[PDB]
């Protein structure tokens, strides 16, 4: 695995540092690395592909060396380097694409294609140049089982669930008191609705609470919190819980009172925020619980006086809302985000060669179904494929 990243980094430096006219003083180590790589790789044989739509490609490594003279590089040296650079780039790209489309149920960390398994031999260890990207460093530190860490720009951790619940219900669907929420990506938009305007409830306060469990534990989470929800704030027609007809929903936004946001970990209330909005920080959390109260307006003006009659006939409803968005995140396990594109490249090669579907990955490498049941084996497969994709993205843009 690490040898592949070393090859990628060395090839990138060779292709983007050896330009005509440059002084020898900036390429000495790279020249030594190139010479070592060619003097070690020569004479072998490699096979790849043969599964799905990748024909069996045979590669032979046989190239000359690089002179240790010509303190200033001329164009002939540039082209002689360029030929071998092109051949190595093609080999690395094809090997990576062949590896990217093979999966196993167990021991997903280890390679599966014959190319990488051969490359994991002993004599090929001589080329292990360096490790600088996030994925390669995290992989090599996981090999020693130390603390892992990734940085994400607005990730997508919450599984999709457009589910709703009703605390109080009747087959007439004209007297409801419950909550509605959406879990779409890094956006949580919860809302609590009432039809009775809390006239019946004691103390004129209707308690609302909601729980969303995260599949993985995050650290150093910056959370943007807003007191208004912009999804469950329009007239809607919604299917019933079991589903036999359609009920109506006419909302009005009210100011939330005593908003409480708590980040928990295994049942411990770690971070708390009371009546606060803007931005909050959770050092370590795995579950989110929100609580807010609908309060009947103690004083009224003519318009809102006619808005809520004291009887059962209700023409308008009342609903409060909250908005939660994960700005940035740091996790101990690999994920898919909105900034990095490794998942995109994996799916791109997947649908380019239409490899059959293994029982460890849902069809199309979709994210929602995969995150529905996040298993450690699938996690390891994701980590391996994402590291290989990061290696690939350093060579073919």
């Amino acid at each position: 695995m690490d040898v592949l990243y070393s090859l990628s980094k060395t090839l990138k430096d060779a292709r983007d540092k050896i330009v005509e006219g440059t002084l020898y003083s900036n390429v000495s180590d790279l020249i030594q690395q190139f010479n070592q790589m060619i003097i070690t790789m020569n004479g072998n044989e490699f096979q790849t592909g043969g599964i799905g739509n990748l024909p069996i490609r045979n590669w032979n490594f046989n190239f000359g060396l690089l002179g240790t003279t010509l303190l200033n590089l001329d164009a002939n040296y540039v082209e002689t380097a360029r030929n071998t650079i092109d051949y190595f780039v093609d080999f690395v790209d094809n090997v990576c694409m062949d590896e990217m489309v093979r999966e196993s149920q167990r021991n997903g960390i280890a390679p599966q294609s014959d190319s990488l398994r051969k490359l994991s031999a002993i004599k090929f260890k001589r080329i292990n140049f360096d490790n600088s990207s996030e994925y390669i460093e995290n992989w090599n530190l996981q090999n020693r089982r130390q603390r892992t860490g990734f940085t994400f720009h607005k990730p997508n951790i919450f599984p999709y669930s457009a589910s709703f619940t009703l605390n109080r219900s009747q087959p007439a669907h004209d007297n409801l008191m419950g909550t509605m929420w959406l879990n779409a990506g890094s956006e949580i938009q919860v809302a609590g609705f009432d039809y009775s305007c809390a006239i019946n409830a004691p103390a004129n306060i209707q308690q609302f609470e909601h729980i969303v469990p995260l599949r993985r534990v995050l650290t150093t989470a910056t959370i943007t919190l807003l007191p208004d929800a912009e999804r469950f704030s329009f007239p809607r027609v919604i299917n019933s819980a079991d589903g036999a007809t359609t009920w109506f929903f006419n909302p009005v936004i009210l100011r939330p009172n005593n908003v409480e946001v708590e980040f928990l970990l295994n049942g411990q209330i770690i971070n708390t925020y009371q009546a606060r909005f803007g931005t909050i920080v959770a050092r370590n959390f795995d579950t989110i619980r929100l609580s807010f109260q609908l309060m009947r307006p103690p004083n009224m003006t003519p318009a809102v006086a006619v808005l809520f009659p004291n009887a059962q006939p209700f023409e308008h409803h009342a609903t409060v809302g909250l908005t939660l968005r994960i700005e940035s995140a740091v996790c101990e396990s690999v994920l898919a985000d909105a900034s990095e594109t490794l998942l995109a490249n994996v799916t791109s090669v997947r649908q380019e060669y239409a490899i059959p579907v293994g029982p460890v990955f849902p069809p199309g490498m979709n994210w929602t179904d995969l995150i529905t049941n996040y298993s450690p084996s699938r996690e390891d497969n994701l980590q391996r494929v994402f590291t290989v994709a990061s290696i690939r993205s350093m060579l073919i843009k």
């Binding site: 020898y24 003083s25 240790t68 003279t69 010509l70 303190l71 200033n72 001329d74 164009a75």
Partner: protein, 98 residues
Amino acid sequence: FGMQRMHYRNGDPQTPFQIAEQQIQNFQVANWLHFVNNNYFRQVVIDGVLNQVLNDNIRNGHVINQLMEALMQLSRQQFPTMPVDYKRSIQRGILLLS
């Protein structure tokens, strides 16, 4: 290189090597000529003591490879409009030093 002999006037602000640098488009010898052109003592201060020291490139012994490559380039050169024995001796001495 089949060029006219360098007409020159003593006392110009530029040394003849600069003119050589901006008149020959053979990359090896031109680069070597440029390196010799701008090879000057470097002014440094160490522990409050002023000293003149050489450049790093020559210090590790690397310019000799450039000189050898330029000489070998001159060795197989056509060397036009020159008698036989003189040219042969010149290029064989160049090979000897290379």
